[PDB]
Symmetry: D2
Subunit: 292 residues, 4 copies
């Protein structure tokens, strides 16, 4: 649902840049087999920026179909215009998705009051559970704990994906919200720390290629076995880091292809193919994780 290891799944493409159903099926089967807790469909790692809203909706619907009730699906629904966020969210009302992942408006840099009004309006136009998503290095704005506290009072706003990498946020938010408000890491390299501080899981890029390890790490964390979990984390740490050696999802798509999980590593501009140096870097991190 909204704890454990949640994959921010890639949108695998053919050489033409359109969704590859065979590759998507292979990925979803992989996540089901690996014990991944849920799938975020067409988030950032899924190239939400370069898909139009129809293409976005097609991918979510296909993912839901292919999941065939075996694994929960959360739709990425972020937009920097509130009217567009509402419209996108409405496409998925009564779809079968279990909730939405919705980013702070990017580029237009709203105030904390603007963030509050944005997310409150979105929540008011849906019965779907809403997961807030904060990632200031990409958006140009920072949803602060006080505002998260304000929004947690809205019935269907039920958690946050916190991608700052600033671990002080965990307990700053936790003290402002109720005990069933979910705290998820959006920063693979600090995710275990985040869970050790009280976080409930991670929406992960690494999980695309190390789904079983990630699922197992998060289980150990939930059970309080942090030393055991850390052995897995150490094995994965080069991936946590190097999957961002070039802009996400360039590295993770290449890694998926290298592992035979997808047919091609094609992306849409302005993402470009991985450099030779990048390939070798990512290959070494895969080797270190014991996946090649």
């Amino acid at each position: 649902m909204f704890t454990g290891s949640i994959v921010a799944i890639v949108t695998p493409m053919d050489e033409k840049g359109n969704v590859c159903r065979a590759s998507l099926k292979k990925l979803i089967d992989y996540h089901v087999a690996s014990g991944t807790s849920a799938i975020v469909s067409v988030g950032t790692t899924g190239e939400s920026a370069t898909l139009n809203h129809d293409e976005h909706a097609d991918v979510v619907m296909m993912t839901l179909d292919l999941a065939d009730g075996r694994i929960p699906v959360i739709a990425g629904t972020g937009a920097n215009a509130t009217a567009e966020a509402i419209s996108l969210t409405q496409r998925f009302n009564d779809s079968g998705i279990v909730g939405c992942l919705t980013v702070t408006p990017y580029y237009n840099r709203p105030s904390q009051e603007g963030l509050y009004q944005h997310f409150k309006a979105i929540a008011e136009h849906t019965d779907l559970p809403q997961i807030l998503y904060n990632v200031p290095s990409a958006t140009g704005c920072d949803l602060l704990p006080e505002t998260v506290g304000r929004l947690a009072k809205v019935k269907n706003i039920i958690g946050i994906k916190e991608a700052t990498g600033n671990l002080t946020r965990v307990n700053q938010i936790k003290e402002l919200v109720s005990d069933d408000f979910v705290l998820l890491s959006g920063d693979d390299a600090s995710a275990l720390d985040f869970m050790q501080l009280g976080g409930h899981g991670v929406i992960s890029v690494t999980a695309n290629v190390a789904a079983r390890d990630m699922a197992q790490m998060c289980k150990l964390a939930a059970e309080g076995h942090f030393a055991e979990a850390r052995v897995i984390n150490q094995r994965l740490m080069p991936l946590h880091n190097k999957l961002f050696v070039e802009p996400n999802p360039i590295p993770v798509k290449w890694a998926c292809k290298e592992l035979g999980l997808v047919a091609t590593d094609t992306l849409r501009l302005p993402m470009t193919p991985i450099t030779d140096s990048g390939r070798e870097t990512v290959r070494a991190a895969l080797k270190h994780a014991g996946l090649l």
Copy 2:
């Protein structure tokens, strides 16, 4: 025209958030009378984020209609997906605009090679002059001088709006490009310094409400009369800063309403109304400028 004072014009709205033709007419007449060099239509200050492409195109076409050949119009055409940037650009071919202002992709954080391929592709599929736009605090990426130098070799990539406020960029770029490449500030508070270092003009928010002073300041700067320009700049400096006291364009729209230039200061979510404290700060800045 791509030198002097260029206004990043507001998109004036009625109480329902729809473009107000009467207010727009008034602003354009004001810029014609006040010596503004050109108008950037539906840039950031024009709420490009919250207009759909149809509304966007409509505002540009309305701006061209109302300008009636008396002042050049530049269209905001930026998008974080290269195919969308290209499509948006095609809408304005043979419209009568003189050029396009196109921002680095926001939120998806492309590499320098990605930025190169993005802008190259946009420029390939139009004859319109292209002005690059770098604003890392808003986008999450930074178009570096080296890449600007590469792009400047493309025939119709003719300049850059450099909004870092990092004045070292002026001569880092100038040394890598031809003498005809236009360097424009996108940071009002440092724009005179930017011109003193070699810059050719400013794409300005302040110019929305101090068009005449901005035009004179930029002409004095172009003539090398920096001390004289700086007297004007000192009167405008509170405005240069306080027009960003709350997210742009909240302050500048309020200022326009206060001066009688627009009927309402309405914005679209996630922009929200100016706070009382903001009104006070902005009004004091307007008075410092001699405008009220």
Copy 3:
């Protein structure tokens, strides 16, 4: 020794700026009564910058005398010249102090290799336990985990005071060092988080005025009772923050005087007396902690 709540004790002064023995006695008695684990004498909070080395040594020796074996004393021994760090350390060989707190060289910005050679040389000229101290916002340099790992191999380098406030450092260092290497927070506001991640205690400014609460919070943390500890943390959080409303130790000296723990709040230039606004801010934080 080197776990639990360790106070970074102020150097109380008379109106002339010299150490006040009566006030120091009162403070040490207070720490003994409160269950403080150890005292850091003439660290940063003790105005190491503005005491000469003789005055510094006099304060340490007086503190040791007054402690009279009831509470362990660690001497601040940092210097930005390695020869001076050695000389200062040598003053305390066979003194009765149980160890030294030694900061990364400030102002001259040594490399990681320079930090390594600096601390290794210091450790080689003493039998005293050495605690490394990293505080990049004050020093202009950052002792990275890899270098800490290197230094932990030196016999008498036994821990670190990590004052970055970056909680990812805890486990980055922990995985590189042996299990008896001590990890202490140098950032009051994040100290409980730091302990929850595996830290062993804190060298605290807050402990100067809330010694009993701090001791109790750290005991709960060590026992794994983080929820209980967090209630205390929440009571102290305004102090954790506002004791830096003006440069440390201006606020904490005023707070000590207000609580009747020291006779005067005098400091040495370039520290200056607390502002009226600062007094009221700190008074409110004391009130919130239930200390006034």
Copy 4:
């Protein structure tokens, strides 16, 4: 003299870390012959951190002796304790130096009021001209234009070495001070820009090895011939950057040894020898400058 090219001179050392008179003589002769405006003796580049005050005074006196009235000498006199700054300044009264270079207190992070009281007190107790020195990356504090403006009203506070590399500071300070207050860059890579904006000269590291070019560049700048100055600056830019590839003055001392200007490139801990990679980078920069 407090305009043009002023060298922040190295303190050349033998293999035991003691000042090398023969090397110092050679450097001073070089600066006399090459048109350098003045010498800053025992500043940062002179390893002020690792000389005691006796060695410090000795080097300044030796520098004055060797200069023999042929070039003005400015003493580094900065300290993070106001009483020490004052004491150090008294050592140089009637020495023959023309002024003092005095840094904002490092490590203890005083407030703006603290900085004001610090420099005011230093200036009160000498007749020597005082040049303020701001370098926040090294000190942990930032002397802001407002405070510079306050201090400039003190009779013998005559200028500032502004080493932020933030070029907006030039006119922010210039507008708050009299036309006779000297603005000097402390950041070689941005120093020509700094002069083009209104600055009067540079206290330079690069000038240690490119004294003639630096002197010509600064004279051209003062005359308004910025394009001509910039040609020189472009040849020196690799040096401006790569002299900080490892901590200053490690690169510049190696460069001086490589040119034959000093007998050895020895430094004091915590400075350590240049790496092989550093040698290669610096040598390439020297060749770009035409010096080898």
